[PDB]
Nucleic acid binder design. Structure first.
Length: 269
DNA sequence: CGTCCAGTCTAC
DNA sequence: TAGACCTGGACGG
């Protein structure tokens, strides 16, 4: 997913796992090329936070748990189909690539990273990807400064629709959000990035925060349906531009589809 | 059947 | 930059 989905998944893990105790090893599916998580505890709690298009899990063993184990942090990226689900241990979804198992007492559940297409990745260590900019949701002011301070970067030579996907400057912005953000201001997607950003040193950088914040405020699971069909309908109904009838579409330089109304902009193919 | 469509990562 | 990495749903013949 994108910022909203990573943020809501994070909120999901914290609520679902608040009163759960995990035990044992962390199991990876045999087909997954991500690394084995070397971690075992008779009794540990799981928590989460999001930053842009990444989510950090913390595995925190209870007082006196065995084996001797310090807390462990994993950072996840979701690629095109990543997701977290809490399921019954015997009813694992089809592409559950990493699993944390509840300990007795109560019914035996699995917290699962589910990723159909396996573009998602996880790293040992809890470090954010170096080079990703601050979170458009949780680090707005730092994110804003990081863009205005670096408009000289050749990243801003590109059309604004391409620039908005560069995770060094818009960590959390993906394909639906660039369409919804540029539609709110009727900025041609192939206006030059530097041209639209120089003019501001509710604007484009403010909406990079407020638009995805709207997806989060729906409750539900953004571009997702872990919360039901109702919350997915609510998301489709919030969209004004992305995939919507009557809207134009072009391929950017990297073959990604940009949705917009009216003027393509000067740098259009 | 078949084609086409839905965010990094890295080899040229 | 262009292709690689994947699975499944939508749609066409």
């Amino acid at each position: 997913g994108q910022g909203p989905e990573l943020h809501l998944a994070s909120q999901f893990v914290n609520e679902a796992c608040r009163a759960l105790v995990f035990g044992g090893c962390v199991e990876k599916s045999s087909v997954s090329r991500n690394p084995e998580v070397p971690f075992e505890s008779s009794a540990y709690r799981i928590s989460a936070s999001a930053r842009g298009k990444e989510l950090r899990l913390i595995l925190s063993p209870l007082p006196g748990a065995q084996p001797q184990q310090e807390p462990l942090a994993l950072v996840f990226r979701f690629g095109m189909s990543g997701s977290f689900q809490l399921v019954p241990r015997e009813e694992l979804p089809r592409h559950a690539h990493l699993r944390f198992y509840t300990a007795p007492p109560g019914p035996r559940l699995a917290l699962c990273f589910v990723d159909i297409r396996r573009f998602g990745r996880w790293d040992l260590g809890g470090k954010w990807q170096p080079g990703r900019g601050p979170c458009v949701l949780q680090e707005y002011q730092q994110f804003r400064e990081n863009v205005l301070r670096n408009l000289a970067d050749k990243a801003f030579d590109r059309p604004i629709c391409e620039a908005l996907l560069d995770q060094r400057f818009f960590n959390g912005i993906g394909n639906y959000l660039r369409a919804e953000i540029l539609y709110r201001l009727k900025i041609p997607p192939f206006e030059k990035a530097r041209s639209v950003l120089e003019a501001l040193q509710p604007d484009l950088l403010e909406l990079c925060h407020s638009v995805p914040k709207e997806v989060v405020q729906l409750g539900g699971r953004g571009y997702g349906s872990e919360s039901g069909e109702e919350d997915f309908a609510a998301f489709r109904a919030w969209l004004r531009c992305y995939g919507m009838p009557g809207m134009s579409s072009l391929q950017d330089r990297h073959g990604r589809t940009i949705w917009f109304q009216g003027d393509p902009g000067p740098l259009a193919p």
